[PDB]
Amino acid sequence: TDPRAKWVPQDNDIQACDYWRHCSIDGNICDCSGGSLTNCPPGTKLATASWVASCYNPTDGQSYLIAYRDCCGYNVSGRCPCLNTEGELPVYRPEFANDIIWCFGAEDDAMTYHCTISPIVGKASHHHHHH
Amino acid sequence: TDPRAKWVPQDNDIQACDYWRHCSIDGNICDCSGGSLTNCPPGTKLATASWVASCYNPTDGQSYLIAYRDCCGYNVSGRCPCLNTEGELPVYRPEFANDIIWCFGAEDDAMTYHCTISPIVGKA
Amino acid sequence: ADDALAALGAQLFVDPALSRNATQSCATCHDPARAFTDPREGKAGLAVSVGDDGQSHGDRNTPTLGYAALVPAFHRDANGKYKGGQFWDGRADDLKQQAGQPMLNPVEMAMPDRAAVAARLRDDPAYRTGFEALFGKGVLDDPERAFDAAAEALAAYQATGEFSPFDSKYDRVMRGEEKFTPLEEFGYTVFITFNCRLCHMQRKQGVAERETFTNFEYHNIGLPVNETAREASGLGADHVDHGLLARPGIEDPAQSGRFKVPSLRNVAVTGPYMHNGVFTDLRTAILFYNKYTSRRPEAKINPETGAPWGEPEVARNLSLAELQSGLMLDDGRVDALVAFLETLTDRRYEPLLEE
Amino acid sequence: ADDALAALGAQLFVDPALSRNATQSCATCHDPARAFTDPREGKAGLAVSVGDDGQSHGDRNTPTLGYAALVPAFHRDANGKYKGGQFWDGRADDLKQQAGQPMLNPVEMAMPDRAAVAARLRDDPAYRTGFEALFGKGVLDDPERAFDAAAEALAAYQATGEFSPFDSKYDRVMRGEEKFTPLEEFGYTVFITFNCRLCHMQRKQGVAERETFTNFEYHNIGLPVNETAREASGLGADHVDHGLLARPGIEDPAQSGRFKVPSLRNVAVTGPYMHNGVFTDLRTAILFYNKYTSRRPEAKINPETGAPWGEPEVARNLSLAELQSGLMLDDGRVDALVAFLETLTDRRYEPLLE
Amino acid sequence: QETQGQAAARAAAADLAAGQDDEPRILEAPAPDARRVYVNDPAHFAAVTQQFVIDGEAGRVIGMIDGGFLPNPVVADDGSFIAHASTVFSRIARGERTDYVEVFDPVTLLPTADIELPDAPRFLVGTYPWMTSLTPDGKTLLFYQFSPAPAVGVVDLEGKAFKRMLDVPDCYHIFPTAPDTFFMHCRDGSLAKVAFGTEGTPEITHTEVFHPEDEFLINHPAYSQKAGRLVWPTYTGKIHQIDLSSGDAKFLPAVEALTEAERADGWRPGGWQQVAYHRALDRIYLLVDQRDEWRHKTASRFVVVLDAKTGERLAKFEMGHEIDSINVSQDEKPLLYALSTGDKTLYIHDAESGEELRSVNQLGHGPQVITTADMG
Amino acid sequence: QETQGQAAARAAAADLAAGQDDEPRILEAPAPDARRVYVNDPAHFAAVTQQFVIDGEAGRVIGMIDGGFLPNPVVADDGSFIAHASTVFSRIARGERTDYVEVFDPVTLLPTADIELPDAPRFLVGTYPWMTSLTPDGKTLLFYQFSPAPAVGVVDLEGKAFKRMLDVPDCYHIFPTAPDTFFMHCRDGSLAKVAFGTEGTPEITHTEVFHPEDEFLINHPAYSQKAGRLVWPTYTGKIHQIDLSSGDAKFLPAVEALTEAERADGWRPGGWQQVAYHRALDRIYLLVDQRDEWRHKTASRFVVVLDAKTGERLAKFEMGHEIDSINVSQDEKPLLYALSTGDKTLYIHDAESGEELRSVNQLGHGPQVITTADMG
Ligand code: HEC
Ligand code: HEC
Ligand code: HEC
Ligand code: HEC
Ligand SMILES: [Ca+2]
Ligand SMILES: [Ca+2]
Ligand code: NA
Ligand code: NA
Ligand code: NA
Ligand code: NA
Known part of the structure; x- marks a missing residue:
C-alpha cells in the first residue's frame, strides 16, 4: 500500500493487485466479474491483441511472459480495479504499453473495456525490464 | 448524520442535504453542478412537471410549498446527492412522490435526470 | 375624497x-x-x-x-x-x-x-x-x-x-379559518404541480400577497373561433382577432393571437369561458388543455359539441412549451380542479354555485 | 537397437x-x-x-x-x-x-x-x-x-x-545462454503479441518444452494458386487443392482449403513458402498477412509481382477471426519479424543465412 | 475458509507446475439454480447501469449485464431466461430516446431478443420490481407507463414484438396472475383486475377498497407469483396480504410486523425492498429499525421474520450492516440476501439463524434491487 | 470564508423576505476567462464519462459536459468554443459504434456542431490530451488513429465535416503548428513534421533522432501552441524542449528537473499529466516524488518549478495530497491546478507560493485531465 514503493509480487491470491501475473495490468481483474485468471466472463468478447510483460514469479524464481488480453464489449466491471506498470513503456513502444484499450480482434468489433486476463505465454525477459 | 433521526432543517447552506427547502428532494442539488437554488445548469432542460412538499422554514417559522423541478437531459451530476422524504407518499399519490423522474415538459423531450431545483410556490 | x-x-x-x-x-x-x-x-x-x-x-x-x-x-x-x-x-x-x-x-x-x-x-x-x-x-x-x-x-x-x-373559500383556507375538502385539496395540489400554475399564478416563485390566479401575461392557447359569436359580431368570416397584436404600437408578429391570462377568481360563476365565450361549462375549459397532452381520441373532441375543438383562430405563437406538459388530466383530477376553482368564488356569489 | x-x-x-x-x-x-x-x-x-x-x-x-x-x-x-x-x-x-x-x-x-x-x-x-x-x-x-x-x-x-x-539462437536464448539483439527481441515480441502466436505456437498458454512454432492445426489463410507450380504439376487448370478435406475420412466441408500450420523452425533457409511455394522471400510471406489488416493500397499487392496477390484458391473457411486482427505490420515490424524468424534456424544452417 | 482468489492462485500454481495447458475463452455461467441472485444497480439515476449475477452459495459474481437508464429487471421463475426493459439515448443522456426489452440466455448472458418499444413508453422511476412483470408462462412482459396517463404495455417475448398499450384507471404496479390477467393498485385503495386481449378494451374490475387514504402502502411490496400472494406493508409495518391464487382477490387478515410497544418506541420499516416472502415456508421478512416517521427510505439494521398465517414473530435478526433491500432464495434452508446501497455490498445470511455467511462487495455505484428465481 | 452554499442561502432568504420574484430558467455559464479550468473524468474506462467546467477563481462548478467512452477534450485558446471527440455504442457498451466530434458554445454549453467520424476511427486509450488537437486558427481538429496503423484524421470544424485520414509513419501524438501542419513523435526517436495543406499524401519530414532507445518520453508532454513550445519529460525527469515557433523543430538545451543526488535518492516524475508549462513566465512545473522506477503512473506529492531557459529550479512545493495531474492558468499570478484521481478532487493552488487556495470535490469517478485556455 505505499503506492510509490517497488511492487512486491505474491503467488497466493489472484484477485489482489499484487498477484505476480498482474505486473503490468491496467483495468480490472476478470476473475472478479465471472471470468477466471485466464478466461473472460460470459457475454464479453476475448480480444486477440495483447500486451506483454515479463513478470517475476516469486514462487519458482522464474520470469514468465504474461500476454494480457482484454475481455471486451461490456462497460468496465468496477470490481478488482488494478493498475501496475512493471516494465511498462510509453505509447510509442505499444508492445509494452498499457493505457491502450487492447480490444482489437474481439468478436463483433467489441471495443469497450470490461476486464483483463493474465495468461502465461513463455519464459523470457526483456532488455528494458529483466529480473 | 444518524440517517434514521428526524430530519432537522437549516436555512444557512443550500448545498447541504439538511437545507430546509430540500425536505423532499431526491437526486442532486442543482447549485452544485452550475445551476443555482432555483435555476438549472447550462445545457440542461427545465422540466415543467413538479412534485410538492410542505417544508418548514426555520428562519420564519412558516411552512412553504416547494414545487421541485428537475433539470434534465444530462447524466446525473454526481455532486451533492441528497434524498429526503418529508411528507413523501408512495407512487400512487404522485403529487407527493419523489422516486419518479419528473422530467415531463422539458425541452427537446429531455428525460434523463441531472439535478433538482427547490423553488417556493406558496405558503402551506 | x-x-x-x-x-x-x-x-x-x-x-x-x-x-x-x-x-x-x-x-x-x-x-x-x-x-x-x-x-x-x-x-x-x-x-x-x-x-x-x-x-x-x-x-x-x-x-x-x-x-x-x-x-x-x-x-x-x-x-x-x-x-x-x-x-x-x-x-x-x-x-x-x-x-x-x-x-x-x-x-x-x-x-x-x-x-x-x-x-x-x-x-x-x-x-x-x-x-x-x-x-x-x-x-x-x-x-x-x-x-x-x-x-x-x-x-x-x-x-x-x-x-x-378576497373572501372566497380559498382566501379563508389560506387565512387558516377553514380547510379544503380532500377533493378541493387534491385540486389545489394538481393546479400547483401541473402546468396551470405556469400561467394562472401571479409569481414564478415566492408567495403572492393578493393572488388573483393570473400572471398577467399574454398567451395564445390555440382557441378556435366562436362561430355563433363571430357571426353575431358581424366582423366577417375572414376576420382574425389578433389579440395583443391589435394593441396600437405592438407590431411584433409573435404577439398575434395572444390574449391576457384571465384571473380565475369567480371563474365558476362567470361562464361562458375564454375571450370569445366559446365554452359554456368550466369542465370544458379545463378539458381543452388535454388536447395538448392526451393521446386519446376524446382529447381532441369538445364535449359540448361532440366535434373537434377546431383549428386555432391563430395557428402560430402557441404556448406549446407550457401546454405540451406530457401529462394529461384524468377525470379524477379534472373533478379536483373544478372543486378547487369553485373555492375561488367570492363569498357573496357562493349562492350562484348551486345553479 | x-x-x-x-x-x-x-x-x-x-x-x-x-x-x-x-x-x-x-x-x-x-x-x-x-x-x-x-x-x-x-x-x-x-x-x-x-x-x-x-x-x-x-x-x-x-x-x-x-x-x-x-x-x-x-x-x-x-x-x-x-x-x-x-x-x-x-x-x-x-x-x-x-x-x-x-x-x-x-x-x-x-x-x-x-x-x-x-x-x-x-x-x-x-x-x-x-x-x-x-x-x-x-x-x-x-x-x-x-x-x-x-x-x-x-x-x-x-x-x-x-x-x-533444438540448437537455434532462439533455443540458446531461452536457455539463458545468450540474448536476442534488440531487433530480434522486438521481433519475438511482435510474434507473441500480434496474431502469429494464435497459430504458430504449440500451446495456448503455459511454457512449451520443445516449442516448434506451430499448434499443429489446419487453417485456410486464403492463398492464391501458384500458377507456374500448378502448370508444372500437370493437375490441370481445373484442379483445386482442398487441403485437409483431401484426407480420406474427412468429409466436413468446413475443412476445405485448410492446411497444416508449418513449424517455423529453419523457415529462413527453406524458401519458397506456403504449401505451393508461391512466395520466394520470407518477407513476402509475412507481408501476405497484411492483406487482412492494412487499408493501404500496397497491402493488396504481392511485392514479388507488383500485381494483386490473387483470389484465394478456396474462398471459404478462411481463418478470418485470427487473420482480421485490426493491426497491420509496418515495415519496422516486418523487419523485426524477419530477424526473429532467422533466430529459429538450426546452428548447422546458420552459414546459409549468409 | 480459503478465499475464492486464494483457491484460484493455488490452482493456477499447480497447473503451471504440472505444465497444464487450457484455452483462454469465454466462460459460461453455471446453470441457474435456486441460489443464483441478481443485484441491479440503478446507480443513483445514472444514464447507464449494471446488473450482477451472483452465485449466492459461493458468494461469487458469475456474470454481469449492462443496462441503460433505470431499467426494470425480470427473472423467469423457472430459470429459463432473464430480461430487462431499458432506455438509451443517442448522445449519452440527450438526443433520441430508445426504449427496448432485451431477453438474455441465463448461461451465456447473450441477448437472445432485442425488442423496440415504440414512442419511448417506459415509466422512468427509481426501480420498483413490480413496475415490469412477466406473466407466469414467461411468454409476455408487462411494463407500466405513467405519461401521459397510467397505462400498461404488453410485449410478446415469444414473438419478440411489442403488442399494445392498455389504458388503465388511476392505478400503479403490475402483478400478473395469468397469461392474460394482472392486478394493479389504485389510488382509491382498491386493486384493479385487468384482463386483456390482442385488441379491444380490457375488462377492468375493481376489488373492494382494502385500506384507508391515510395508510401508505410501500412502493416495494413482495409478490409471489407461484403462490399468488401479494404481501404489502404500510409505512407502520402493518402488512396487507392479498391472495390472488383463485384468480380473484381474497383479502387475508392484516398482521403487524412490529409490536405495539416497538411502534410506540419508534420502530418502523424502512429502506427500498423492505419486504420478502418465502413461498414454501409462508414466511414474511421485513426490514425495520427505530426511525422517524418520514425516514422511510433510509437503511435499516434489523429484519423481523413472521408467520404469514398467524402474524407470529419467528425471529428478529440484527443484520450488522446498513441494509436497504432484502430478498430470500426460495429453496429449503433459504438464504436471506441483505443488500446495502451505501456499502455497495450484498451480505448473504442464513435465513433461519440470521448469521452472515459471506458477502459480495463492489456491486456498482448504488445497488438497490435483488431478484431471485422461484424454481421449486 | 462564508462558503458558496452559505452565501446562496442568505441571498435566497433575502429574496424571500423582500418578495423578490425571479423566473426559474437555464443559467448561462460566466464568460470563458483565464481562470476557467476543465476537468475530464475518463472514469476508469467507463462507457460514459463527464467533463466539469470550473471557475478556478471561485472554486465552483459552472457547468458540465457529458461524453462517451474515453473522449478527447479540446479547448480553443481564445475561449470561443470547446469540443471533444467521443465514442458511443447502440447498447451502452456493445452494438454499433459511433465516433463523433461535438463543438459546444462555452457559455450555454449547447452543442453547435455534431460531426460523425466515419468507420469508428478514434484511438481508444487512457486520455492523452495531444492525441486530439486543434489547429491554431481553431478551424480544424486533428485526432489520432492507432488501428490498423498510426494515422491522423482531419475534421473541418468550420464546414462541420470530417475530411480525410492522413497516413503517417510509426508515430504518436499531434502538435499542430499551423492551419496545415503538425508534428508527431516517432518510434525511432525523431519528430515528424506532417504538412497536409495540399490534398493527397502529406509532406512528411523527420528531424534527427533526439533521444536514445532507452530514454522514455512520457505520454503527457506539455505543448503550448501559442509559444510553439513542446516540453517533454522522460521517466527520469530529464526535459526535452523543442521550439516549433519557426514552423520547424529546433531542439533547445535539455534540462534536468531533478538533481543527480535526488535521482540517486529515488526521485522520479510520476502520475498522469506530470508536466505543465506557463507561456508568459516560460516556466515548467513537474510532478515528482520518491518512487521505484516502474511506479511511474502513481500519484506524486511534490511539484518542482523550473526556469525553461536555464533549467534553474525556482521552487519545490509539497502539495499535501496524492496528485496525479497538474496544469496552470496562463494569466498573471497563475493558479497551479493539482487534480487527485483518487480523491476525485481538484485542488487549486497559488502557482507562486504553492499554497492551496480552494478545492472542488466530487468530480466524477476517476478524474485525470485538466485543460485551460491560453487567452493572453
Ligand atoms: C400557457 C398559459 C396557460 C396555461 C399553462 C393554462 N392556462 Fe388557462 N388560460 C390561459 C389564457 C391565456 C386564457 C385566456 C385564453 C383566451 O381566452 O384567449 C386562459 C383561460 C382559462 C380559463 C377560462 C377563464 C375565463 O375567465 O374565461 C380557465 C377555466 C383556465 N384557463 C383554467 C386553466 C387550468 C385549470 C389550467 C391547467 C390545466 C390552465 N388554465 C393552464 C393561459 C394558461
Ligand atoms: C355592451 C356591454 C358592455 C358595457 C355596457 C360595458 N362593458 Fe366593460 N367590457 C365589455 C367587453 C365585451 C369587454 C371585453 C372587450 C375586449 O376585450 O375588447 C369589457 C371589458 C372591460 C374591462 C377590462 C377587464 C379585463 O379583464 O380586461 C373593464 C375594466 C371594463 N370592461 C369596465 C367597463 C366600465 C367601467 C363600463 C361602463 C363605463 C363598461 N365596462 C361598460 C362589455 C361592456
Ligand atoms: C490463422 C492461423 C495463422 C496465423 C494467425 C498466422 N499463420 Fe503463418 N501460417 C499458417 C498456415 C496454416 C500456414 C501454411 C499456409 C499454407 O501453406 O496453406 C502458414 C505459413 C506461414 C509461413 C510460411 C512457412 C513455410 O514453411 O512455408 C510463414 C513464414 C508464416 N506463416 C509466418 C506467420 C507470421 C509471421 C504470422 C503473424 C504475422 C503468421 N504466420 C500468422 C497459419 C497462420
Ligand atoms: C520427389 C521429392 C520427394 C522425395 C523423394 C520424398 N519426398 Fe517427402 N515430401 C515431398 C513433398 C512434395 C511433400 C509434401 C507433399 C504433400 O503435402 O502432399 C513431402 C512431405 C514429407 C513429409 C511430411 C512433412 C510435413 O511437415 O508434412 C515427410 C515426413 C516426408 N516427406 C518424408 C520423406 C521420406 C521419409 C522420403 C523417402 C522415403 C521422402 N519424403 C521422399 C517431396 C519428396
Ligand atoms: Ca366569461
Ligand atoms: Ca518451403
Ligand atoms: Na358559439
Ligand atoms: Na398593433
Ligand atoms: Na510461381
Ligand atoms: Na476426404
Whole structure:
C-alpha cells in the first residue's frame, strides 16, 4: 500500500493487485466479474491483441511472459480495479504499453473495456525490464 | 448524520442535504453542478412537471410549498446527492412522490435526470 | 375624497345616462349579481354582449371586473414578455384609460363623443355637485376634463374592496379559518404541480400577497373561433382577432393571437369561458388543455359539441412549451380542479354555485 | 537397437535404390544441406519438386523434415479442431504411415508396388543383415513386412536428435545462454503479441518444452494458386487443392482449403513458402498477412509481382477471426519479424543465412 | 475458509507446475439454480447501469449485464431466461430516446431478443420490481407507463414484438396472475383486475377498497407469483396480504410486523425492498429499525421474520450492516440476501439463524434491487 | 470564508423576505476567462464519462459536459468554443459504434456542431490530451488513429465535416503548428513534421533522432501552441524542449528537473499529466516524488518549478495530497491546478507560493485531465 514503493509480487491470491501475473495490468481483474485468471466472463468478447510483460514469479524464481488480453464489449466491471506498470513503456513502444484499450480482434468489433486476463505465454525477459 | 433521526432543517447552506427547502428532494442539488437554488445548469432542460412538499422554514417559522423541478437531459451530476422524504407518499399519490423522474415538459423531450431545483410556490 | 371619488364612480357605474339611448350602464353588462359579467342572452347566448342600440354584438366575452384592479399597468418586462393592461388584448394601459372606451364605442354604450357625455353629466344636479367637489368648478363644461374625470371616478370605484373582497373559500383556507375538502385539496395540489400554475399564478416563485390566479401575461392557447359569436359580431368570416397584436404600437408578429391570462377568481360563476365565450361549462375549459397532452381520441373532441375543438383562430405563437406538459388530466383530477376553482368564488356569489 | 533401427533408416534415407530408376532417394528432395528441403530448380523454380522420372513435378512444396517428429499423430481434438498428422493436408497419421507414400508415388520415387521395394532391399547384403537383426529372419522376403519395416526405420531415423537438435539462437536464448539483439527481441515480441502466436505456437498458454512454432492445426489463410507450380504439376487448370478435406475420412466441408500450420523452425533457409511455394522471400510471406489488416493500397499487392496477390484458391473457411486482427505490420515490424524468424534456424544452417 | 482468489492462485500454481495447458475463452455461467441472485444497480439515476449475477452459495459474481437508464429487471421463475426493459439515448443522456426489452440466455448472458418499444413508453422511476412483470408462462412482459396517463404495455417475448398499450384507471404496479390477467393498485385503495386481449378494451374490475387514504402502502411490496400472494406493508409495518391464487382477490387478515410497544418506541420499516416472502415456508421478512416517521427510505439494521398465517414473530435478526433491500432464495434452508446501497455490498445470511455467511462487495455505484428465481 | 452554499442561502432568504420574484430558467455559464479550468473524468474506462467546467477563481462548478467512452477534450485558446471527440455504442457498451466530434458554445454549453467520424476511427486509450488537437486558427481538429496503423484524421470544424485520414509513419501524438501542419513523435526517436495543406499524401519530414532507445518520453508532454513550445519529460525527469515557433523543430538545451543526488535518492516524475508549462513566465512545473522506477503512473506529492531557459529550479512545493495531474492558468499570478484521481478532487493552488487556495470535490469517478485556455 505505499503506492510509490517497488511492487512486491505474491503467488497466493489472484484477485489482489499484487498477484505476480498482474505486473503490468491496467483495468480490472476478470476473475472478479465471472471470468477466471485466464478466461473472460460470459457475454464479453476475448480480444486477440495483447500486451506483454515479463513478470517475476516469486514462487519458482522464474520470469514468465504474461500476454494480457482484454475481455471486451461490456462497460468496465468496477470490481478488482488494478493498475501496475512493471516494465511498462510509453505509447510509442505499444508492445509494452498499457493505457491502450487492447480490444482489437474481439468478436463483433467489441471495443469497450470490461476486464483483463493474465495468461502465461513463455519464459523470457526483456532488455528494458529483466529480473 | 444518524440517517434514521428526524430530519432537522437549516436555512444557512443550500448545498447541504439538511437545507430546509430540500425536505423532499431526491437526486442532486442543482447549485452544485452550475445551476443555482432555483435555476438549472447550462445545457440542461427545465422540466415543467413538479412534485410538492410542505417544508418548514426555520428562519420564519412558516411552512412553504416547494414545487421541485428537475433539470434534465444530462447524466446525473454526481455532486451533492441528497434524498429526503418529508411528507413523501408512495407512487400512487404522485403529487407527493419523489422516486419518479419528473422530467415531463422539458425541452427537446429531455428525460434523463441531472439535478433538482427547490423553488417556493406558496405558503402551506 | 378617496371615498368620495369612488362613490362618484359608484353612481356613474349604474347610470344608463352614459349611453346614447339611455338603455345601458356599465352595470348592464357587468352585472354585480353575476360577478360583474353579463347575464343577458343575445344572438350568441351569453358569449358576447349587446350594446345600447339593442342590436350590436361585440366579438369578445364580457369579463368580470372583480380583481381587475390588481392588474399592473401595461408594460414589456425585461424578459421581453408583455404584461398587464386591460381588455383581453391589453389595448388599454390601465382602468382609467379603459373606462371611457365603452361610453364612446358604437357597439356598446354608443355616445357620439365626449361633449355628448359631458352634456348628460351636466343635466344631473347630483353630478354637477359631485364632480365639481372633486375636480373643480366648471369641470363639466369642459368635455375633455368631464370625460377624464368620469373615467377616474369609475377606475376608483373598481379599485374598492367591493370588487376585490378576497373572501372566497380559498382566501379563508389560506387565512387558516377553514380547510379544503380532500377533493378541493387534491385540486389545489394538481393546479400547483401541473402546468396551470405556469400561467394562472401571479409569481414564478415566492408567495403572492393578493393572488388573483393570473400572471398577467399574454398567451395564445390555440382557441378556435366562436362561430355563433363571430357571426353575431358581424366582423366577417375572414376576420382574425389578433389579440395583443391589435394593441396600437405592438407590431411584433409573435404577439398575434395572444390574449391576457384571465384571473380565475369567480371563474365558476362567470361562464361562458375564454375571450370569445366559446365554452359554456368550466369542465370544458379545463378539458381543452388535454388536447395538448392526451393521446386519446376524446382529447381532441369538445364535449359540448361532440366535434373537434377546431383549428386555432391563430395557428402560430402557441404556448406549446407550457401546454405540451406530457401529462394529461384524468377525470379524477379534472373533478379536483373544478372543486378547487369553485373555492375561488367570492363569498357573496357562493349562492350562484348551486345553479 | 533404437540406435540400430534409426541407423538402418539413415541408410535407407540416402538410398536411391528405393526409387524406380534409382535416380532419387529421400535425401534428393529433403536435402540435409538445405534443412531437408529441395534445392533443385525445376519448371516452377523451387516451388515444387521433380520425381524419379525426371519430369513429373508435384503440386505442393517439399517441406522440411526437421522437427516433423514433434508433431502429434492425426486426431480431432475435443473442440472439433483437427490436429497433427503429416503432409500439408494431414493425410498421413504419423511418420511411419507417411514414409511409404513417396516410395510408391509415381510423381515422386515411383516404385510400382511393395514387392518391387522388397526386391531392391533383398538385393543389398547389408539390408539383409540389418533388417533381419531387427525384424527377424525372412522379413525381406515378405513384401508387406519389408515395406512396413523400411517405414519404421525411416520414421525412427527422422525421430533422432539430428532432425530436431533444438540448437537455434532462439533455443540458446531461452536457455539463458545468450540474448536476442534488440531487433530480434522486438521481433519475438511482435510474434507473441500480434496474431502469429494464435497459430504458430504449440500451446495456448503455459511454457512449451520443445516449442516448434506451430499448434499443429489446419487453417485456410486464403492463398492464391501458384500458377507456374500448378502448370508444372500437370493437375490441370481445373484442379483445386482442398487441403485437409483431401484426407480420406474427412468429409466436413468446413475443412476445405485448410492446411497444416508449418513449424517455423529453419523457415529462413527453406524458401519458397506456403504449401505451393508461391512466395520466394520470407518477407513476402509475412507481408501476405497484411492483406487482412492494412487499408493501404500496397497491402493488396504481392511485392514479388507488383500485381494483386490473387483470389484465394478456396474462398471459404478462411481463418478470418485470427487473420482480421485490426493491426497491420509496418515495415519496422516486418523487419523485426524477419530477424526473429532467422533466430529459429538450426546452428548447422546458420552459414546459409549468409 | 480459503478465499475464492486464494483457491484460484493455488490452482493456477499447480497447473503451471504440472505444465497444464487450457484455452483462454469465454466462460459460461453455471446453470441457474435456486441460489443464483441478481443485484441491479440503478446507480443513483445514472444514464447507464449494471446488473450482477451472483452465485449466492459461493458468494461469487458469475456474470454481469449492462443496462441503460433505470431499467426494470425480470427473472423467469423457472430459470429459463432473464430480461430487462431499458432506455438509451443517442448522445449519452440527450438526443433520441430508445426504449427496448432485451431477453438474455441465463448461461451465456447473450441477448437472445432485442425488442423496440415504440414512442419511448417506459415509466422512468427509481426501480420498483413490480413496475415490469412477466406473466407466469414467461411468454409476455408487462411494463407500466405513467405519461401521459397510467397505462400498461404488453410485449410478446415469444414473438419478440411489442403488442399494445392498455389504458388503465388511476392505478400503479403490475402483478400478473395469468397469461392474460394482472392486478394493479389504485389510488382509491382498491386493486384493479385487468384482463386483456390482442385488441379491444380490457375488462377492468375493481376489488373492494382494502385500506384507508391515510395508510401508505410501500412502493416495494413482495409478490409471489407461484403462490399468488401479494404481501404489502404500510409505512407502520402493518402488512396487507392479498391472495390472488383463485384468480380473484381474497383479502387475508392484516398482521403487524412490529409490536405495539416497538411502534410506540419508534420502530418502523424502512429502506427500498423492505419486504420478502418465502413461498414454501409462508414466511414474511421485513426490514425495520427505530426511525422517524418520514425516514422511510433510509437503511435499516434489523429484519423481523413472521408467520404469514398467524402474524407470529419467528425471529428478529440484527443484520450488522446498513441494509436497504432484502430478498430470500426460495429453496429449503433459504438464504436471506441483505443488500446495502451505501456499502455497495450484498451480505448473504442464513435465513433461519440470521448469521452472515459471506458477502459480495463492489456491486456498482448504488445497488438497490435483488431478484431471485422461484424454481421449486 | 462564508462558503458558496452559505452565501446562496442568505441571498435566497433575502429574496424571500423582500418578495423578490425571479423566473426559474437555464443559467448561462460566466464568460470563458483565464481562470476557467476543465476537468475530464475518463472514469476508469467507463462507457460514459463527464467533463466539469470550473471557475478556478471561485472554486465552483459552472457547468458540465457529458461524453462517451474515453473522449478527447479540446479547448480553443481564445475561449470561443470547446469540443471533444467521443465514442458511443447502440447498447451502452456493445452494438454499433459511433465516433463523433461535438463543438459546444462555452457559455450555454449547447452543442453547435455534431460531426460523425466515419468507420469508428478514434484511438481508444487512457486520455492523452495531444492525441486530439486543434489547429491554431481553431478551424480544424486533428485526432489520432492507432488501428490498423498510426494515422491522423482531419475534421473541418468550420464546414462541420470530417475530411480525410492522413497516413503517417510509426508515430504518436499531434502538435499542430499551423492551419496545415503538425508534428508527431516517432518510434525511432525523431519528430515528424506532417504538412497536409495540399490534398493527397502529406509532406512528411523527420528531424534527427533526439533521444536514445532507452530514454522514455512520457505520454503527457506539455505543448503550448501559442509559444510553439513542446516540453517533454522522460521517466527520469530529464526535459526535452523543442521550439516549433519557426514552423520547424529546433531542439533547445535539455534540462534536468531533478538533481543527480535526488535521482540517486529515488526521485522520479510520476502520475498522469506530470508536466505543465506557463507561456508568459516560460516556466515548467513537474510532478515528482520518491518512487521505484516502474511506479511511474502513481500519484506524486511534490511539484518542482523550473526556469525553461536555464533549467534553474525556482521552487519545490509539497502539495499535501496524492496528485496525479497538474496544469496552470496562463494569466498573471497563475493558479497551479493539482487534480487527485483518487480523491476525485481538484485542488487549486497559488502557482507562486504553492499554497492551496480552494478545492472542488466530487468530480466524477476517476478524474485525470485538466485543460485551460491560453487567452493572453
Ligand atoms: C355592451 C356591454 C358592455 C358595457 C355596457 C360595458 N362593458 Fe366593460 N367590457 C365589455 C367587453 C365585451 C369587454 C371585453 C372587450 C375586449 O376585450 O375588447 C369589457 C371589458 C372591460 C374591462 C377590462 C377587464 C379585463 O379583464 O380586461 C373593464 C375594466 C371594463 N370592461 C369596465 C367597463 C366600465 C367601467 C363600463 C361602463 C363605463 C363598461 N365596462 C361598460 C362589455 C361592456
Ligand atoms: C400557457 C398559459 C396557460 C396555461 C399553462 C393554462 N392556462 Fe388557462 N388560460 C390561459 C389564457 C391565456 C386564457 C385566456 C385564453 C383566451 O381566452 O384567449 C386562459 C383561460 C382559462 C380559463 C377560462 C377563464 C375565463 O375567465 O374565461 C380557465 C377555466 C383556465 N384557463 C383554467 C386553466 C387550468 C385549470 C389550467 C391547467 C390545466 C390552465 N388554465 C393552464 C393561459 C394558461
Ligand atoms: C520427389 C521429392 C520427394 C522425395 C523423394 C520424398 N519426398 Fe517427402 N515430401 C515431398 C513433398 C512434395 C511433400 C509434401 C507433399 C504433400 O503435402 O502432399 C513431402 C512431405 C514429407 C513429409 C511430411 C512433412 C510435413 O511437415 O508434412 C515427410 C515426413 C516426408 N516427406 C518424408 C520423406 C521420406 C521419409 C522420403 C523417402 C522415403 C521422402 N519424403 C521422399 C517431396 C519428396
Ligand atoms: C490463422 C492461423 C495463422 C496465423 C494467425 C498466422 N499463420 Fe503463418 N501460417 C499458417 C498456415 C496454416 C500456414 C501454411 C499456409 C499454407 O501453406 O496453406 C502458414 C505459413 C506461414 C509461413 C510460411 C512457412 C513455410 O514453411 O512455408 C510463414 C513464414 C508464416 N506463416 C509466418 C506467420 C507470421 C509471421 C504470422 C503473424 C504475422 C503468421 N504466420 C500468422 C497459419 C497462420
Ligand atoms: Ca366569461
Ligand atoms: Ca518451403
Ligand atoms: Na358559439
Ligand atoms: Na398593433
Ligand atoms: Na510461381
Ligand atoms: Na476426404
